[PDB]
Design an enzyme around this catalytic site. Structure first.
Site, short mmCIF file in Angstrom:
data_model
loop_
_atom_site.label_atom_id
_atom_site.label_comp_id
_atom_site.label_asym_id
_atom_site.label_seq_id
_atom_site.Cartn_x
_atom_site.Cartn_y
_atom_site.Cartn_z
N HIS A 1 0.80 -1.13 0.01
CA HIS A 1 0.02 -0.09 -0.10
C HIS A 1 0.80 1.25 0.02
O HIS A 1 0.21 2.49 -0.10
CB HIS A 1 -1.02 -0.02 0.99
CG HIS A 1 -0.58 0.55 2.47
ND1 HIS A 1 -0.26 -0.47 3.57
CD2 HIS A 1 -0.27 1.73 2.85
CE1 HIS A 1 0.09 0.42 4.55
NE2 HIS A 1 0.18 1.57 4.27
N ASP B 1 -0.13 -7.40 1.83
CA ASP B 1 0.43 -6.02 1.89
C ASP B 1 1.91 -6.02 1.73
O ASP B 1 2.48 -5.79 3.01
CB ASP B 1 -0.08 -5.11 3.16
CG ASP B 1 -0.02 -3.73 2.87
OD1 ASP B 1 0.45 -3.45 1.65
OD2 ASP B 1 -0.08 -2.88 3.81
N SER C 1 4.18 2.59 7.85
CA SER C 1 3.86 1.30 6.98
C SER C 1 5.21 0.96 6.12
O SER C 1 6.04 1.95 5.88
CB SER C 1 2.86 1.62 6.04
OG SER C 1 1.42 1.57 6.50
C1 LIG Z 1 0.60 2.98 5.06
C2 LIG Z 1 0.97 2.95 6.52
O1 LIG Z 1 1.43 3.79 6.87
C3 LIG Z 1 -0.19 2.59 7.49
C4 LIG Z 1 0.41 1.80 8.71
C5 LIG Z 1 -0.79 1.87 9.81
C6 LIG Z 1 -0.15 1.17 11.06
N1 LIG Z 1 -1.17 1.36 12.27
C7 LIG Z 1 -0.93 0.72 13.50
N2 LIG Z 1 -1.80 1.37 14.38
N3 LIG Z 1 -0.21 -0.12 13.57
N4 LIG Z 1 -1.46 1.63 6.78
C8 LIG Z 1 -2.54 2.23 6.68
O2 LIG Z 1 -2.77 3.72 7.06
C9 LIG Z 1 -3.55 1.51 6.03
C10 LIG Z 1 -3.65 1.87 4.64
C11 LIG Z 1 -5.00 1.52 4.13
C12 LIG Z 1 -5.59 2.28 5.26
N5 LIG Z 1 -4.81 1.92 6.50
C13 LIG Z 1 -5.31 1.80 7.73
O3 LIG Z 1 -4.58 1.41 8.45
C14 LIG Z 1 -6.64 2.11 8.01
N6 LIG Z 1 -6.90 2.77 9.29
C15 LIG Z 1 -7.60 0.59 8.32
C16 LIG Z 1 -7.57 -0.17 7.20
C17 LIG Z 1 -8.19 0.20 6.03
C18 LIG Z 1 -8.30 -0.64 5.04
C19 LIG Z 1 -8.16 -2.15 4.89
C20 LIG Z 1 -7.39 -2.43 6.16
C21 LIG Z 1 -7.01 -1.68 7.13
#
Ligand SMILES: *C[C@@](*)(O)[C@H](CCCNC(N)=[NH2+])NC(=O)[C@@H]1CCCN1C(=O)[C@H](N)Cc1ccccc1
Ligand SMILES: *[C@@H]1O[C@H](CO)[C@@H](O)[C@H](O)[C@H]1NC(C)=O
Ligand code: NA
Ligand SMILES: [Zn+2]
Ligand SMILES: [Zn+2]
Ligand SMILES: [Zn+2]
Ligand SMILES: [Zn+2]
Lengths: 39, 250
Positions: free
Chosen positions: B43, B99, B198
């Site tokens: 992603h 992912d 991420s």
């Molecule tokens: C892309 C990254 O920076 C990030 C990492 C998040 C880690 N968070 C925690 N608490 N460890 N990922 C996100 O922002 C991802 C990308 C897509 C949306 N997303 C989410 O985390 C949403 N808040 C939840 C989600 C949406 C769609 C599918 C799965 C989870």
């Protein structure tokens, strides 16, 4: 696992840090992980 | 990284920072698995809703970085990408299943005191270390809280959480290609990855051969460090064959 010729280098020289494992030095929180293994 | 600490110099030499080229913008974390291969979250490279569909030329990676404000002359390395590989079955429309993405550097980088690869788990290592209760380490330059950004790489150690508990903490569909980690409200300790973390690695130190192994990739979560909520990570060992296929293909 990996063909050196595609992977490059590293397979055999991975996960060992020059400034820590290579000098026989522990980082400041690494023990937390080790202790989590101990039951 | 929320509720974490500053990382010491050279503590995570496999740490990679994924940057947008024009305009220069920190996008995600990543990890160095060899002198030419970098692992990250799919992603971070492909997420149409956020207008993300990068090509090799839209990005740059920085390795061996200690400060995000200055340039460590011959310490930090900036590399361009030759090719990008996204898992073909990465489900960005639903739950971010698979992912994971690989990026091949244009020119291999020389290892140093500040740059070295992390190991990828083998069947035996994954079996003995990937167990609920066992702690791993997450690092990143992402948000310090639900929002700001750190000037030093952040780190936090977190316990892997049992599947049943992960499943109940959210209504998002969890798959065997994911695992979650974090402290429970009753454990008295906190910490979690957050926005822009991420792609960063969730690593574990093998007490056996003393080597660090990348067990996961920061993938998703709801909010950051909330009680009863846990961070989700791409299960690296489960997708090693795809990694093998890609690296041994090209
Ligand atoms: C892309 C990254 O920076 C990030 C990492 C998040 C880690 N968070 C925690 N608490 N460890 N990922 C996100 O922002 C991802 C990308 C897509 C949306 N997303 C989410 O985390 C949403 N808040 C939840 C989600 C949406 C769609 C599918 C799965 C989870
Ligand atoms: C990525 O952008 C390319 C056009 O340049 C497009 O063909 C491809 O379908 C995009 N990937 C998507 C939207 O999943
Ligand atoms: Na939590
Ligand atoms: Zn070396
Ligand atoms: Zn401080
Ligand atoms: Zn849309
Ligand atoms: Zn420095």
């Amino acid at each position: 696992a990996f063909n050196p010729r595609t992977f490059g280098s590293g397979e055999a020289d991975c996960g060992l840090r020059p400034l820590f494992e290579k000098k026989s030095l522990e980082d400041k929180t690494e023990r937390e992980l080790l202790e989590s293994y101990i039951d | 990284i929320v509720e974490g600490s500053d990382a010491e110099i050279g503590m995570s030499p496999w740490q990679v920072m994924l940057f947008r080229k024009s305009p220069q913008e920190l996008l995600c974390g990543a990890s160095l698995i060899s002198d030419r291969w970098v692992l990250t979250a799919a992603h971070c490279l492909l997420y149409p809703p956020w207008d993300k569909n990068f090509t090799e030329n839209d990005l740059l990676v920085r390795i061996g970085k200690h400060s995000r404000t200055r340039y460590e002359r011959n310490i930090e390395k900036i590399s361009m990408l030759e090719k990008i590989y996204i898992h073909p079955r990465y489900n960005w429309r639903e739950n971010l299943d698979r992912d994971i993405a690989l990026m091949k550097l244009k020119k291999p980088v020389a290892f140093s005191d500040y740059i070295h690869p992390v190991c990828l788990p083998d069947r035996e290592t994954a079996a003995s270390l990937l167990q609920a209760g066992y702690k791993g380490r997450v690092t990143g330059w992402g948000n310090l809280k639900e929002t700001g950004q750190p000037s030093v790489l952040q780190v936090v150690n977190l316990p892997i959480v049992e599947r049943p508990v992960c499943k109940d903490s959210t209504r998002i569909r969890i798959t065997d290609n994911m695992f979650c980690a974090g402290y429970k409200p009753d454990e008295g300790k906190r910490g979690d990855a957050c926005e822009a973390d991420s792609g960063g690695p969730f690593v574990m130190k093998s007490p056996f051969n003393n080597r660090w192994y990348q067990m996961g990739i920061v993938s998703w979560g709801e909010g950051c460090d909330r009680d009863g909520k846990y961070g989700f990570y791409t299960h690296v060992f489960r997708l090693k064959k795809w990694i093998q296929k890609v690296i041994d293909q090209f």
